[PDB]
Design a protein around this ligand. Structure first.
Ligand SMILES: C=C1C[C@@]23C=CC(=O)[C@@](C)(CCC(=O)Nc4c(O)ccc(C(=O)O)c4O)[C@@H]2C[C@@H]1C[C@H]3O
Ligand SMILES: C=C1C[C@@]23C=CC(=O)[C@@](C)(CCC(=O)Nc4c(O)ccc(C(=O)O)c4O)[C@@H]2C[C@@H]1C[C@H]3O
Lengths: 411, 411
């Protein structure tokens, strides 16, 4: 039976352009939310987001290649290179066939979709860029990274809205465990802070409109919450079969032990009050890992800061953890980072892993006045020191009622 | 060890709005390509495509729900309902948790992306539809079908350009075999025949521009070929664990025995001359199925009608089949249907299955003057009667160099 471990990490987020800088900022409760300045937000109900500050790909992507990629792909590539470098893995003719990728995005290249469509409206199809398709489609991060590293193994890209990051990581692990690969770079990337992204999610009445205090906007489980805050970035993990990792002397961050999936079968853009779908996904991951709920020390929640979404997950956690419900720590790092959509489950899996390494759990900031009758410990305001934590669980749910949960185990 | 079989089929294509009507047309060598009339093609270099004729969802999708979905989702839903009905499966509180979906698309809702962006350009973000996001994103076919049927099991959506259909079907099978589900509705849907789709792929110099003879445009392996022909539609299969199918008396079309994946690691929009990536995917599927190349009776090719793409796959088939290379039949149904992109591998898996049932293989029409020095039997012009065919193989390759192959076995 093939075990899967994590041997490399890469990340760009609204609170940092590296894995360690991001983690340090989160443990310090720092918000990465600010006013948007790259497009005129005068007519927009929401005028802020979690932006990647000073993104730099100068020594990573050539000038000729950059022009063929939407920002989401550039972010995904940079984070993937960080992960591959961190892993110390060396690609050879002999193992190239055994290394692949599972990397997705929820919405893909909105920026270049807008640019190409604007061009078409203004001057006809002759003005569409030859790069339109490959610069926008969701699977292009995987495409570029395999070419860059000479990876010939399986490559897939799961696009399940906010569940993407978790599904790609989960299936990369399945692929390795099944025997189709020994290593996979997996994760997600997103850059939806554009007119269509902000305007689109705004049209759905899904975003916080707290323009007067952007850093206090994302407040999961707080009574004054009014929708999610969009965040940009990318998270990538190098997953690897255990004996393969040991043989080459890899550094091992944690083990990936459980992966659960479910569907709400309720409504396209809202969960059932019950949180039955969320619960089933967590139950499935626990069964996959062969452990009980009481063994989980921390749950990095989906917790987007929407009125109904946050309540359903709290109900789901209560259902699954029962008597232990008050003893597990639960936090939503989206309180600081915003919602990275297709990259959310990827960066949040990284947070779940580092929590095991450092035995420290990041807080749900802004939780000033929690919804009434719920006795869960949402790690409000300040990071928490933990002691003999062996397992963490990461939840990611998505439009369409698609759910996913991953469980990581220390060492 | 859990075996996976096919118990239901659903399909909309340019040659028919049902599984049997489509198959009858293909065995008869009928083209489904015609001039586009739903948008003004005056300024477009390519003015034809494979369109779904007289699509009807009146008794399937309510008027209230139709307005929330791009055409690709409406096609995917109709084909999924056809498959679920064909399967005879009855969803209960007891099995709901064991039934899921793996359905994707390569490009998603171009039609409604254009409509929403046009609205934004003309009147600001206030004019974007509240349905923008859920009406366009790739995972919405899976989302709607799970809600419609009350499916609570795993739902994923793989978006790997033209490889989508094969990857979704392959991973649905993996999910069942692993134990995460007993049944999965899997496949793909696409409706990229819009200004951005035709103009976008046209900008890349990837489409045939034979406007004076649209039905002769798609001509895989023919010397006068000049790019692919875009096709719309959707293909869905109900996959099911073997003992589960038998117990309820399901009708069984074929068994899914092998699934292989690879990456070219060559170029974003073209394969290597070698076809090494295509070859590895077929090799992987053969190994997964535990059989030799000589046992395959028919290969339904990726064969899009591009100069370099068709040559690389012919080289790959020669590499894998060697001495048997001239004895296996190879055909590209895209010669009649056009390229359904994210749905191509789904409808083509259906063709691969029916070929086993009927012991008949559809032709590569338009193959008037085959490229020189290649001795493969591409089933030119006319369908072929076969005799003791036990295995078929379906190839699907995609931008980003991502490849996939599936192998189906009779009974
Ligand atoms: C149907 C409704 C009712 C409505 C009312 C209260 C709410 O909380 C929101 C604002 C968001 C629900 C949600 O959490 N969806 C939801 C979900 O199910 C799965 C994933 C996500 C995600 O962000 O990743 C998500 O956001 C909904 C959205 C739309 C309009 C609002 O009035
Ligand atoms: C890089 C080039 C060179 C060029 C020259 C000859 C060709 O054949 C085409 C027209 C298409 C190659 C191809 O088959 N890609 C290709 C591929 O790798 C994987 C999938 C598909 C698919 O359609 O699903 C596909 O189409 C390419 C496209 C672009 C411009 C042309 O001059």
């Amino acid at each position: 039976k093939r075990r899967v471990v994590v041997t490399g990490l890469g990340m760009l987020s609204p609170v940092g352009n590296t894995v360690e800088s991001t983690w340090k900022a989160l443990l310090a409760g720092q918000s990465g939310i600010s006013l948007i300045d790259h497009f005129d937000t005068s007519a927009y109900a929401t005028k802020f987001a979690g932006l990647v500050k000073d993104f730099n790909c100068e020594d990573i992507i050539s000038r000729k290649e950059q022009r063929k990629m939407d920002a989401f792909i550039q972010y995904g590539i940079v984070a993937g290179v960080q992960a591959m470098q961190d892993s110390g893995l060396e690609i050879t003719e002999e193992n190239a066939t055994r290394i692949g990728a599972a990397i997705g995005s929820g919405i893909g290249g909105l920026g270049l979709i807008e640019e190409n469509h604007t061009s078409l409206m203004n001057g006809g199809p002759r003005k569409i860029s030859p790069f339109f398709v490959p610069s926008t489609i969701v699977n292009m991060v995987a495409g570029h990274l395999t070419i860059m590293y000479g990876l010939r193994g399986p490559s897939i890209s799961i696009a399940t809205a906010a569940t993407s990051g978790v599904h790609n990581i989960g299936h990369a692990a399945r692929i390795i465990a099944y025997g189709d690969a020994d290593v996979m770079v997996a994760g997600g990337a997103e850059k939806a802070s554009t007119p269509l992204g902000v305007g689109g999610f705004g049209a759905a009445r899904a975003l916080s409109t707290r323009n007067d205090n952007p850093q206090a906007a994302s407040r999961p489980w707080d009574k004054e919450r009014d929708g999610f805050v969009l965040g940009d970035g990318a998270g990538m993990l190098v997953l690897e079969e255990y004996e393969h990792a040991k043989k080459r002397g890899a550094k091992i961050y944690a083990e990936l032990v459980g992966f659960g999936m479910s569907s709400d079968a309720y409504h396209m853009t809202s969960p059932p009050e019950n949180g039955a779908g969320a619960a089933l996904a967590m139950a499935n991951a626990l069964r996959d890992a062969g452990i009980e709920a009481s063994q989980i020390g921390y749950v990095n929640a989906h917790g987007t800061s929407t009125p109904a979404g946050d309540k359903a997950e709290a109900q789901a956690v209560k259902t699954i953890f029962g008597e232990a419900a008050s003893r597990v720590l639960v936090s939503s790092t989206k309180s600081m980072t915003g919602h990275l959509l297709g990259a959310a489950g990827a960066v949040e899996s990284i947070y779940s892993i580092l929590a095991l390494r450092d035995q420290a759990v990041p807080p749900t900031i802004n939780l000033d006045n929690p919804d009434e009758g719920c006795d869960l410990d949402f790690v409000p305001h300040e990071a928490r020191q933990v002691s003999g934590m062996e397992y963490t669980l990461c939840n990611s749910f998505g439009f369409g009622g698609t759910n996913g949960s991953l469980i990581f185990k220390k060492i």
